[model samples]
Target: KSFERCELARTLKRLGMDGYRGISLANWMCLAKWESGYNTRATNYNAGDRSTDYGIFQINSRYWCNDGKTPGAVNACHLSCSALLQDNIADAVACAKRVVRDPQGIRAWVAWRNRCQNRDVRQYVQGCGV
Candidate 1:
């Protein structure tokens, strides 16, 4: 499922992502747009290393989630990779929070690194009224 821009902003705010741990809503919104276009069911596969990213936050299988067939998966989120691919974002949010607490924080996401880092992202939530 995909969310309208404002709706996505409101949802993230309600989930305490507006500026949780110094990661702002704008950054999250920009990361979502670049990572998965806010699609809950989004999945990305890398053929070179046979790795996959799941859900809107694109949590990876190599460490954060277990894809079963992927070797050496640490299951850091303590859940299946498929759990992140739901329209209801609770699980995804929970796992993503864990990601943010890691050493890299939000920088774990390449999209955030390339597009959201050190940028003025106010435009992403300009009309959300949240």
Candidate 2:
């Protein structure tokens, strides 16, 4: 559990403070839920195939990262997984932060929580909730 918590913390750090400390970790987690369902293995059925999408934040293999590890396992391997798992944590976080900084992500996340205002939106109890 602690290891996982550490990993999430590392991710949060990668997200940075938006160069102005405007974003919050709670909001980031909310966006992560919306984007990836906090399941790294999440995939978009809208894609042509069962793309190598992965992780609690549902990072797409092709868009988010460079060629990842996998001994000649290109097609079957999820490069984003490799990027987040090995290549660079800060870069991953930065990308996540940028996504959140976007107006779409911010507005959507706030509305999402507002929709469930009757519920405890602050509850980061999911996979990335650590």
Candidate 3:
């Protein structure tokens, strides 16, 4: 499933990424655009280690989701990577919340690191009224 930017922003706000808690909705929306283009089925492989990034938030198989075939996968979310590639974002959101609580916060996303950090991504949620 693909999400309109405002819809994604509103949903995320309801999910606890309203900016005050830790991650800004705008920041995450921007990261999503780059990470998955708002497509739930998005997946990418890291050539260096052949690990995978999954779903809208692109959670990594190295630590969060189990790809089944990947050796020593941590599966911190105790979910299959395929679980994130769904229209409903519940699993993805839950895992992402856990991710942001890590010391690096949203910086766990390289997309956030290169494009969103220290930047005013408020434009991403401009008319969302969240």
Candidate 4:
């Protein structure tokens, strides 16, 4: 519940989750750092259209938040940071697991890396929570 990136990494390691799968750890970290500073207490700066974006993945609140789908459906803010606040290794873990179902935790990374190679996004090889 309360953890820094390193501690979060340990939790993910134990869960067999890999942040590198969805996006580069550095890039994801960049996002996490920017999005919410890894703060589960963080809420949207913009109060409008809160439904379409909620959770660590910024999952559409309308689709998951109390929608009877996804995993955590508690509240917008709670689900927004569910990765660290609720489950999975981190937000990226939940995204990778839910999106690609990459149980091995490497497929999404490979996929993204390949995509990034073509998109000139290689500079984002590492970052924060994306």
Candidate 5:
């Protein structure tokens, strides 16, 4: 599913992404915007490690979810990569939280760093009422 910008921001807040692990909802919004353009089914395949990034948050098979094709991948999120592709997004949000528990926090996602960080991320949540 492709979400409208403010709609996704509000939805993310409802799922407790407002300040999970010191990351703001706006930052998350920006992350999702740059990562998958708000489309739940978006995916990117990485040939370097034969891994694929799945879903809106682009959870990687190499370190986060299990996809049969990824060699030596770890299921740190303890669920199949397919779960991240669901439009419901609840599962994806929970997995996103799990990813931030590490020292890297939101930095775990490169798009967040390259596109979201040090920018006017407030635009993502400005009218969301979140």
Candidate 6:
């Protein structure tokens, strides 16, 4: 599922991403935009640690979920990477909630820091009606 921009914005807001750990809906929108362009089945392989990043949020398997392939990986989110690839983002959203609870908060995503951090992220949700 490749979501339309406003569609994703409204969805994230409904999913409680608006201020989850002080991160706004616009920021989450920016992260998803840069991470996977709102595609539900997006996947990125990391040979560095033999891990994979999955789904719209690009949640990684190395530390967050179990892909059954990453070396010494920890399933902090207690999820399977397959769950992140579903059209329904409920499981993915739950895992993301756990991610931000860590000390890194939303900084867990490098793409957010490089593209979303301190930028005028309001453009992401400008007309989303969230």
Cα lDDT tens digits, model 6, 53-78, are 99999999989999898999999999
Q: Which digits, one per residue and each the tens of the lDDT, describe model 1 over residues 57-118? A: 88898888888877666889998998999898888888988899998989999889899888
User: What is the descending lDDT order?
Assistant: 5, 6, 1, 3, 2, 4
Model 5, 7-40: lDDT tens digits are 8998999999999999999999999999999999
Models 1 onward score TM values of 0.95, 0.45, 0.93, 0.43, 0.98, 0.97
TM-score of 4: 0.43
Given candidate 2, what's the lDDT at residue 12?
65
Please identify model 3 stretches exceeding 4 Å from their true place.
none
Across 1-130, the per-residue lDDT of candidate 3 in tens digits comes to: 9999999988888877777446678888999998998889998888777789999999999999898866677988888898899898988998888787788888888888888888888889999998
Which candidate ranks first by lDDT, i.e. highest? 5
For candidate 4, lDDT tens digit of each residue in 1-130? 2347655444445545544345444444334444454554443422453333433433344433443443433543234433433534355455534544434333333433443334543243323232
Pick the winner on TM-score between candidates 1 and 2.
1
TM-score of 3: 0.93
Better of 2 and 6 by TM-score: 6
lDDT of 2 by residue, 1-130 (tens): 1124435544664556423246556555555556555444444432453344444554445544444532232422223454444323454465555455556654533434554334454555345534
**Which 10-residue window of candidate 6 scores lowest in summed lDDT?**
9-18
Local error of candidate 6 at residue 85 (angstroms): 0.1
Ten contiguous residues minimizing lDDT sum, candidate 2: 70-79
Alpha carbon lDDT of each predicted model:
0.89, 0.46, 0.86, 0.42, 0.93, 0.92
Candidate 2 pairs with clashing backbones: 14-93, 15-93, 38-56, 39-55, 40-54, 40-55, 40-56, 41-55
